[PDB]
Each structure stands twice: as C-alpha cells, then as structure tokens.
Amino acid sequence: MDIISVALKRHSTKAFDASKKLTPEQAEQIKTLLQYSPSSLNSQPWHFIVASTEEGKARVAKSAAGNYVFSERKMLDASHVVVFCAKTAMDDVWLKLVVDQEDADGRFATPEAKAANDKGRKFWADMHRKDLHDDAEWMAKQVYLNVGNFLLGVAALGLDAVPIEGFDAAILDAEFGLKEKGYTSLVVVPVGHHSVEDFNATLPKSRLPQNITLTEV
Amino acid sequence: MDIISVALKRHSTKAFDASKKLTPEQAEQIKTLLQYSPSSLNSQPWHFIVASTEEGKARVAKSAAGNYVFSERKMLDASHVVVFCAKTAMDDVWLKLVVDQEDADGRFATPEAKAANDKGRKFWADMHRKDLHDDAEWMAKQVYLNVGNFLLGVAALGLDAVPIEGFDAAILDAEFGLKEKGYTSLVVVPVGHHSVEDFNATLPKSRLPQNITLTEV
Ligand SMILES: Cc1cc2nc3c(=O)[nH]c(=O)nc-3n(C[C@H](O)[C@H](O)[C@H](O)COP(=O)(O)O)c2cc1C
Ligand SMILES: Cc1cc2nc3c(=O)[nH]c(=O)nc-3n(C[C@H](O)[C@H](O)[C@H](O)COP(=O)(O)O)c2cc1C
C-alpha cells in the first residue's frame, strides 16, 4: 500500500493462527530483510535463528519460561520465528569477513582502496573496543536497528508479527549454544497471521503527541 | 516494486542535492514514521529534533567537529536532518503520560484495565531501572529500533538518507540543552535526495552470505 498506511495498520500480534503459514516466497523474503539491513560501518554484528518447524520452535519457546511464559504461545503458534542475535565482541576476523566480502562485491577499485576502508573501519571499531569499551552495547544497537527494519518489512509483505523482549535470553543462548559461537539473544520476533484471540488486532493504536516527542528547528 | 526491492535499492547517501527539498507532505510523513514506531511496553523513550532551516541544520552540524568533520557536509546539504534522542532515565511520570494517552485513544474498556496495564508496564520497567540497572541502554535500543524502521520507511517514500554515528553527542546535547531535559543524542539522520558526488549511489550493496549469519531450525 502506502508505507504510512503500513506503519499505521501494523500491530503486535498477541495470538497467531497455527493454520496460516508463510508462502514459500515470503519465507525467503524475510531472510532477505534480515540480511540486507543497514549497519554502522557495515559491521553486520548479528546472527539469526529462523525456526519454521514445530521441533525448532519448541526449542525457542523453551525461553518463554518463568516470568515470560505468556510469550510461549506466540512463539509456538506463529509460522516462522526469528531470533535476533548480536555479537558479544567485535573481533578482527569479523571485520575482515566484511571487507573481504565488500571486495568480492566490487566495492573497491584497487587493493589500496580496500586497505583504507579496512583501516578506517578499525579506527571506529577500536574507538568502541579499546577506548569506550562499549562494543557489546554498540553491536546490540545495530541488531535493534535491524528489528525495526524487519518489523516494518514483514508488515509491508502482508504478515503479522510481534517483537518479544519477554523471554529468557540465558535459556535461549544455551539451547542454541550461542555464547560459544559469539552471540547473544536480544529480540525474538514470531511472524505469521493473527487469530481471533489477537485482542490487539481489535484495539486502536496509541502514540504520544508530536508536541511532546518532536522539536522543529 | 515491493518492500524487498526498496530494501535492496536503498543506500547511505554521502552527498545531498541542496536544491532538492522534501515536499510538505513528505515532511509530515517522516514525522509520522518517527511517532508511530513500535517500542517495548510502548514506552516511546524518545525525542526527535527535525532541523529543516539553514540555521537549524547548522546548529546540528556543530556536532560534526574533530573526528566527525566529514559528516558536516551531509548534515548541511540534506533537506531535513533528524536527530534521534533517547531518554536518560525512565521516570514514573513518563510511564503515566503513556498510560493516560492509551486511555484517551480508547485502548481500555474500564479503569481497572488501565491500572493493570499500568501495573504491567512498571513490573517490567522496574526490572530495568531497579533490578538490572540498564534502562538507559534499554531505552537507547528502542531508539535504534526506530531508526531502522525510519530508514526503510523514507526509502519507500522515495527519499535518500544516511544514518550517522560519526558525530559529537556532547556538543549536540549541549547545543539543544538536552542533558538537563532528560535526553541524549544517538543517531543523526539527514533525509533528502542525493547528488552526483554521492559515490555510494554508484556502488553495489554488500552483505554477508546467509550461510554465515543465518541458521534455519
Ligand atoms: C523491543 C520490543 C520488545 C517487545 N516485547 C514484547 C513482548 O515481550 N511482549 C509483547 O506482547 N509485546 C512486545 N513488544 C510490542 C510492544 O508492546 C508494542 O509494539 C507497543 O505496545 C506498540 O504497539 P504496536 O505493536 O501495535 O505498534 C515489544 C516491542 C519492542 C519494540
Ligand atoms: C547506526 C549507524 C550509524 C552510521 N553512521 C555513519 C556515519 O557516521 N557516517 C557514514 O558515512 N555512514 C554511517 N552509517 C552508514 C553505514 O556506512 C551503512 O549503513 C553501511 O555502509 C551499509 O551500507 P548501506 O547503507 O548502503 O546499506 C551508519 C549506519 C548505521 C546503521
């Protein structure tokens, strides 16, 4: 439609139709949206677990325990469930994985252009890893950037979704052995189609007036 | 043209056409995208500065100093420059500004439900400020979610934009007297139309293969 209509009609789904699945085209498009999100320095400090099977989602919903239990039925009833992960540290091999891939895609005309882009990227990586000591919080911010991108992208595809912070990230890091590969769960986003028990599909949307949140200068 | 064509054709603009400005409809649409972004608990832990005048951009461009001087020129040539700000602490009055706004929009059928909604939001807010002590970083992540949704929304509006971390947020907090109001600069996003000197408009996009970043389960 209009991208403003999409932003105004999308909502966090509270109940999913377990009968409605993603089309096989949609199942690949959402993978495109995770991949092609922008990131600072093109660092791409992230990993995704896309659970489509009942066996794989039951593994994710293990994280909806304790205080987060009202999040399990959303992870189980949705068609596909995306887990957004962030790197736990920025290492030079990942920095090298990015520039060597930028080179493979023809972003550099000469090797010397590749080395100044490699060197300049480490100038600002080091300002996070070595100086401010905040590369973990920094990389976690780029993954949230991807979520906002992803939530409006699956909405524009005609899909319902909910972002979830109401999950145990220690349980979900363990189930998929994430900490040892160098990642951490941040947001879990189930995607699919809502059901009649989605009570939020029948409510109006609320936001604060721009006269509170926005300043024109 | 779908949202996947948009996600694949958008780019970070490195040079803007200073003659190409946003239409007055576009200038209100980008304001909607900032307002209607989703947030955890609908906390909306945000503030935006939209600079459209030459003085207003030049005040923002004050933050492009030192190591960030190569950012000044984008902030000046763009049509509109949006500064994304995050709250420095989650206060109980803001939580109530939200509950009271959800009520005014008719999201509650009874007063008891408004108090249970209030009760649920403080159970989870206190888990950030009082238990985990990370509400400042928690709230900064929702702002980064908004940026990621903002970038893909203006792309679908037909606009070129660049997200910026290369700026002094202490200069930019001071220039707008933000720190005393309870806010901090995070990302600066100039929006508009690119110029021929945008070297990034003529390069291919690069992302890591899904076989490295993505796991299907
Ligand atoms: C980072 C983040 C985490 C969220 N976590 C949850 C969650 O755990 N459970 C839930 O029901 N909704 C969750 N939401 C959805 C918000 O409650 C919702 O976006 C907010 O009320 C705005 O409503 P909307 O989705 O209709 O725009 C989350 C949203 C964000 C941005
Ligand atoms: C959080 C964030 C901060 C960024 N800051 C800058 C910046 O300071 N200067 C700049 O030239 N580009 C900046 N970028 C743009 C990145 O270089 C760009 O997203 C990356 O190269 C991916 O390329 P793409 O925008 O064409 O998809 C930033 C991007 C993000 C997501």
- Residue-wise DSSP of A185-196: EEEEEEEE-B-T
- The pick from B63, B74, B165, B202 for probing ligand 2's pocket by mutation, whose C-beta has the most ligand atoms within 8 angstroms, reads B165
Give the span between the Cα atoms of A74 and A200, in whole angstroms. 13
Distance between B122 CA and the closest CA of chain A, angstroms: 14
Nearest CA to ligand 1 atom 6: A164
SS3 content of chain B, % helix, strand, coil (to 5): 50, 15, 35
Nearest to A206 among B48, B105, B124 (CB): B105
CB contact burial A113-134 (16+ within 10 A = b; e otherwise):
ebeebbeebbebbeebbeeeee
Q: What is d(CA B203, CA B193) in angstroms, rounded to the nearest whole number?
A: 17
Residues A19 and A202: beta-carbon distance below 8 Å? no
Strand partners, A41: none
What atom of ligand 1 comes closest to residue A68's alpha carbon? Answer: 8
Output the CA A66–ligand 1 centroid distance in Å: 19
Beta carbons within 10 angstroms of residue A29's beta carbon? 19
Token pair 């996947």: residue: B4
User: Closest Cα to residue A102, out of A116, A89, A123, A90?
Assistant: A116
Distance to chain A for B134, nearest Cα, Å: 11
Per the structure, the complete domain to which residue A54 belongs is given by 1-217
Whether A187 and A143 have beta carbons less than 8 Å apart is answered as yes
Output helix, strand, coil percentages for chain A, rounded to the nearest 5: 50, 15, 35
Spatial separation of the C-alpha atoms in residues A45 and A94, rounded to whole Å? 8
Identify the three-state secondary structure at position B16: strand
Of A49, A68, A48, A70, the closest CA to residue A60 belongs to A49
* Nearest chain B residue to A212, by CA: B47
CB atoms within 10 A of CB B210: 16
CB environment B132-170: b (16+ within 10 A), e (fewer): eeebbbbbbbbbbbbbbbbbbbbbbbebbbbbbbbbbbe
Assess whether the C-beta atom of B182 lies below 6 angstroms from ligand 2.
Answer: no
CATH code at B53?
3.40.109.10
Q: Which two tokens stand for residue B91?
A: 């206060």
Nearest-atom number in ligand 2 for the CA of B148 is 31
Q: Whose CA is nearest to atom 17 of ligand 2?
A: A41
Mutate to test the interface with B, among A30, A68, A135, A214 (most CBs of B within 10 A): A214
CA A149, A151, A157: angle at the middle one, nearest 5? 100
Residue B191, beta-bridge partner list: B80, B161
How far, in Å, from the CA of B164 to the mean position of ligand 2?
6
CA distance B155 to A38: 12
Q: Which residue, among B128, B186, B143, has the nearest Cα to A134 in the 3D structure? A: B186
Contact A35 B106 (CB under 8 A): no
Of the candidates A188, A183, A20, the one whose C-alpha atom is nearest the C-alpha of residue A89 is: A183
Whether residue B162 contacts residue B12, with contact meaning beta carbons closer than 8 Å, is answered with yes
Q: Does ligand 2 have an atom closer than 6 angstroms to the CB of B189?
A: no
Interface test with B, best of A12, A128, A215 (most B CBs within 10 A): A215
Question: Nominal resolution in Å?
Answer: 3.0
Residue A70 DSSP code? G
Nearest to A59 by CA among A217, A167, A180, A182: A167
| In A62-170, beta strands by DSSP E | 80-87, 160-161
Judge if the beta carbon of residue B11 lies within 6 A of ligand 2: yes
For atom 28 of ligand 1, the residue with the nearest CA is B40
Q: Pseudo-torsion of CA B160, B161, B162, B163, nearest 10°?
A: -150
Residues 144-203 of A with CB under 8 A from B: 144-153, 156-157, 163, 165-166, 176, 186, 203
- Number of independent structural domains in chain A: 1
Give me ligand 2 centre to Cα A125, in Å: 13
Instruction: Determine whether the interchain pair A208/B102 forms a contact, defined as Cβ–Cβ distance below 8 Å.
Output: no
Q: For residues B138 and B125, what is the distance between their CA atoms, to the nearest angstrom?
A: 10
A70 interaction partners in chain B (CB closer than 8 Å): none
* Residues shown for chain B: 217
Give CA–CA dist B31/B150, Å, rounded. 10
Breaks in chain B (C to N > 2.5 A) come right after none
Instruction: Please check whether residue A121 is in contact with residue A98, taking contact to mean a CB–CB distance below 8 angstroms.
Output: yes
Residue A180 is inside which H or E element, if any? none
Residues B107, A204: C-beta atoms closer than 8 Å: yes
In this structure, are strands A46-51 and B214-216 parallel, antiparallel, or unpaired? Answer: parallel
Q: What is the SS3 string spanning B99-136?
A: HHHHHHCCCCCCHHHHHHHHHHHHHHHHHHHHHCCCHH
A15 in contact with ligand 1, CB cutoff 6 A:
no
* B43 has a chain A CB within 8 A of its CB: no
Tokens 């109001």 label which residue? B181
